[PDB]
Ligand binder design. Sequence first.
Ligand SMILES: CCCCCCCC/C=C\CCCCCCCC(=O)O[C@H](COC(=O)CCCCCCCCCCCCCCC)COP(=O)(O)OC[C@@H](O)CO
Ligand SMILES: CCCCCCCC/C=C\CCCCCCCC(=O)O[C@H](COC(=O)CCCCCCCCCCCCCCC)COP(=O)(O)OC[C@@H](O)CO
Ligand SMILES: CCCCCCCCCCCC(=O)OC[C@H](COP(=O)([O-])O)OC(=O)CCCCCCCCCCC
Ligand SMILES: CC(C)CCC[C@@H](C)[C@H]1CC[C@H]2[C@@H]3CC=C4C[C@@H](O)CC[C@]4(C)[C@H]3CC[C@]12C
Ligand SMILES: CCCCCCCCCCCCCCCC(=O)O
Ligand SMILES: CCCCCCCCCC
Ligand SMILES: [Cl-]
Lengths: 33, 193, 51
Amino acid sequence: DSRDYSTELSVTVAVGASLLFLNILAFAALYYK
Amino acid sequence: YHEHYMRNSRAIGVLWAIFTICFAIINVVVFIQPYWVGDSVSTPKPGYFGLFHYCVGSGLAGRELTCRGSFTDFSTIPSSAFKAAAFFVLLSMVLILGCITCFSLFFFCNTATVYKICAWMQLLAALCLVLGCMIFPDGWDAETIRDMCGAKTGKYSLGDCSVRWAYILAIIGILNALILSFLAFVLGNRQTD
Amino acid sequence: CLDGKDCASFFCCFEDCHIRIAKMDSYARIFFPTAFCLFNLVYWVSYLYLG
Ligand SMILES: CCCCCCCC/C=C\CCCCCCCC(=O)O[C@H](COC(=O)CCCCCCCCCCCCCCC)COP(=O)(O)OC[C@@H](O)CO
Ligand SMILES: CCCCCCCC/C=C\CCCCCCCC(=O)O[C@H](COC(=O)CCCCCCCCCCCCCCC)COP(=O)(O)OC[C@@H](O)CO
Ligand SMILES: CCCCCCCCCCCC(=O)OC[C@H](COP(=O)([O-])O)OC(=O)CCCCCCCCCCC
Ligand SMILES: CC(C)CCC[C@@H](C)[C@H]1CC[C@H]2[C@@H]3CC=C4C[C@@H](O)CC[C@]4(C)[C@H]3CC[C@]12C
Ligand SMILES: CCCCCCCCCCCCCCCC(=O)O
Ligand SMILES: CCCCCCCCCC
Ligand SMILES: [Cl-]
């Protein structure tokens, strides 16, 4: 097995950033009076 | 204007709850899966290890992963730092699952009070995940982890091993937990308006 | 309180909250089954699928 962790890291960072972005969109919704 | 306000609050509360369930799933996954740190090309032996469970290869140009460790059996955990980190991540799990339960309190309890209570547990959940992720590297100097990664490996030093998807997922869990907490606190102070 | 309320006013419920103890049975009637179902879900999933 090719012992490379690049695609896994990329998809993990992608899903983490997406969840973070949805949360920040929620804050934008609230602090937008 | 007021009906728009109520619709926005209700919808964003639903979204919060969905993201809270997602973070609970994330916490369960990072606690269970043993993919916090793992081998590299320069490592003497292959494998991976999480908070308590660790798998290591025999070293004969094949997989042959022997696996040992279990939170139910603290003797098998390599280090006291590993034990403490596992305990803290559990506590975070308990708190987030307790929040999901409290959702049930929305029927009777004051919405504002529930948001706030769920919010504080989500903050502590974040605090305990922070403590766990800070304490877990402390145990890297254990004999088993050194035999896995190399002589360079030590307290707060990767050496030759590399962090795998569960560790960064736990960091993302910390961020999501602190963030979720706030959205709740403000969700609460707002509901009163 | 980025809003500007009091920190306690924005963080804790040191206003009304205890008083609402008569409804504690009403709370428990749905709290305890939810907690047990959640524990069973995580327990069975963890011991069957994830490990
Ligand atoms: C007891 C039944 C009735 C009351 C139940 C009340 C609830 C209590 C909770 C859990 C059990 C209590 C803790 C018991 C722990 C087990 C007993 C214990 O403490 O002994 C030590 C730890 O053992 C071990 O590996 C055990 C290590 C892990 C113990 C904890 C496991 C996870 C518990 C997660 C709970 C979440 C609850 C959530 C509620 C919503 C070992 O010593 P010993 O000299 O043998 O070592 C030498 C070695 O060579 C033995 O192989
Ligand atoms: C696998 C994971 C499984 C997890 C399952 C979790 C489920 C756990 C059990 C029950 C949840 C109970 C939710 C009940 C929500 C009902 C909320 C409701 O009654 O409506 C109003 C809005 O409340 C609110 O904005 C509160 C919003 C509730 C948000 C929490 C519920 C989320 C359910 C979405 C599920 C998604 C699943 C998807 C997973 C992939 C408040 O009423 P009300 O003005 O009259 O009161 C005023 C006062 O004077 C007397 O109550
Ligand atoms: C097996 C269930 C049999 C009973 C059917 C479900 C009961 C639904 C009744 C409607 C809710 C209601 O107003 O009455 C019960 C209480 C409030 O009681 P009261 O003191 O206001 O009269 O209000 C509540 O506490 C909400 C009801 C929560 C029911 C929880 C169901 C889970 C049951 C777990 C066992 C399988
Ligand atoms: C009461 C509600 C709110 C929370 C319940 C928390 C439950 C889900 C927690 C408490 C203790 C936890 C267990 C503790 C230890 C282990 C051993 C590990 O190798 C697999 C996960 C497993 C089996 C955990 C699964 C989840 C668990 C059962
Ligand atoms: C009476 C409703 C209780 C609500 C909680 C439901 C889950 C209870 C636990 C049932 C466990 C029974 C053993 C199942 C074993 C299996 O997976 O086949
Ligand atoms: C897909 C793997 C899901 C693991 C269990 C999730 C439990 C979430 C909190 C109830
Ligand atoms: Cl285990």
